[PDB]
């Protein structure tokens, strides 16, 4: 026998193809594992993983978040990749030119980008254009802006938001939520 020092037959714990079942996504994966295996280029390697990512690890990148990244010093001509969908943001009043490459473009986002004379590339087109990912700027959206993570870590003095359905006063705002009713959290 063997004094094992570590749990046996452990799975690596990382996705390895998408759990998604879409052909096209399956094809883009085909492109990039090829590209990853044969180009020693970091970008293709990161891109391949993001493809496997489930919906929650793929938060939307907005078109305003886009415009801001372009305002980085020396970044205004880069083409931005977003392995996910791109949404529109009425709140910005002046969107730049550039080229965004992403999986989905909402109707309004595509509009706004094209209106400023930008261009909307799919990842496979992005590939042919920059097989080593030259001049690419990768953007991710906010994962912990989900509503779910509000409730993560619920406990005393954690200050983190109840799992509650109806709300307003007389919904969990008395005993243990204020000094005058028993105590506070």
């Amino acid at each position: 026998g063997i004094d094992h020092t570590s749990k046996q037959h452990k799975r690596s714990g990382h996705r390895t193809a998408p759990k998604s079942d879409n052909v096209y996504l399956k094809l883009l994966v085909k492109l990039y594992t090829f590209l990853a295996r044969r180009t020693d280029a970091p970008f293709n390697k990161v891109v391949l993983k993001a493809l496997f990512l489930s919906k929650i690890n793929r938060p939307p990148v907005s078109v305003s978040r886009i415009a801001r990244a372009l305002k980085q010093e020396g970044a205004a001509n880069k083409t931005v990749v977003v392995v996910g969908t791109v949404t529109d943001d009425a709140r910005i009043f002046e969107f730049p030119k550039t080229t965004v490459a992403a999986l989905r473009f909402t109707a309004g986002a595509r509009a706004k980008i094209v209106k400023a004379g930008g261009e909307c590339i799919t990842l496979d087109q992005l590939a042919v254009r920059a097989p080593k990912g030259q001049n690419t700027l990768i953007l991710r959206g906010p994962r912990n802006s989900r509503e779910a993570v509000r409730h993560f870590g619920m406990g005393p003095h954690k200050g983190k938001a109840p799992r509650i359905l109806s709300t307003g006063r007389k919904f969990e705002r008395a005993r243990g939520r204020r000094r005058s009713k028993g105590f506070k959290v």
Partner: protein, 222 residues
């Protein structure tokens, strides 16, 4: 398109080049190993001639075999048995002696047998059961290119360049020695000497430091 023999040439030539360097190095060590040995022999004599006493340096390298199975072991020794990579019975590793490993051996005496290995038994360990750790994987030695590949960084580009680093506790013994997978010995062929193993060598059992008598054992187990 050349390469046919063309690049086969600039290779095989370059290969002959290395066997050369290995041959001269091995010729070297041999000198060193016997003049080293003889020096001590004559030291002992010269001292007796002068009415004195030649006390040799304490050994710097020991070889440890796990002699106890896997059950009912207390936690402290257990962790140490792991750090020495002795995680199954009859497997063995080399250890460089210092205060800070001396204690480790102290802590695990009931579960191991160790002693000072000779050039002979370090050699036949490596030639017969020497495997390297290469992206883990435990790869058998059997060609010098494998060592040069992973150990060449530190000088060391032959199985004998390996053996030399161990036996002489080189300045890169850590790397040299961790490169070797733990040796996996069969049970002794002779048998254990002794009727009960889990007593000290010094009390008729098998565990503890048995000094130079380690070679007789290992050789029966290798």
């Amino acid at each position: 398109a050349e390469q046919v023999a063309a690049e086969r040439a600039a290779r095989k030539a370059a290969n002959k080049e290395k066997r050369a360097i290995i041959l001269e190095r091995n010729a070297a060590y041999q000198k060193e190993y016997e003049t080293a040995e003889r020096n001590i022999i004559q030291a002992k004599r010269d001292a007796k001639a002068a009415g004195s006493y030649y006390v040799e340096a304490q050994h710097k390298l020991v070889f440890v075999v796990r002699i106890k199975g896997i059950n009912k072991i207390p936690p402290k020794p257990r962790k140490v048995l792991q750090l020495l990579r002795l995680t199954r019975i009859n497997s063995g590793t080399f250890v460089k002696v210092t205060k800070a490993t001396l204690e480790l051996l102290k802590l695990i005496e009931p579960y191991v047998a160790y002693g000072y290995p000779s050039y002979s038994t370090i050699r036949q360990l490596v030639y017969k059961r020497g495997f390297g750790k290469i992206n883990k994987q435990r790869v058998p030695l059997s060609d010098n290119a494998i060592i040069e590949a992973n150990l060449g960084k530190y000088g060391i580009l032959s199985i004998d360049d390996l053996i030399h680093e161990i036996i002489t506790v080189g300045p890169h013994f850590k790397q040299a020695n961790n490169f070797l997978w733990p040796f996996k010995l069969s049970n002794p062929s002779g048998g254990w000497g002794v009727p009960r193993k889990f007593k000290h060598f010094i009390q008729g059992g098998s565990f503890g430091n048995r000094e130079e008598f380690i070679n007789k054992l290992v050789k029966s187990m290798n």
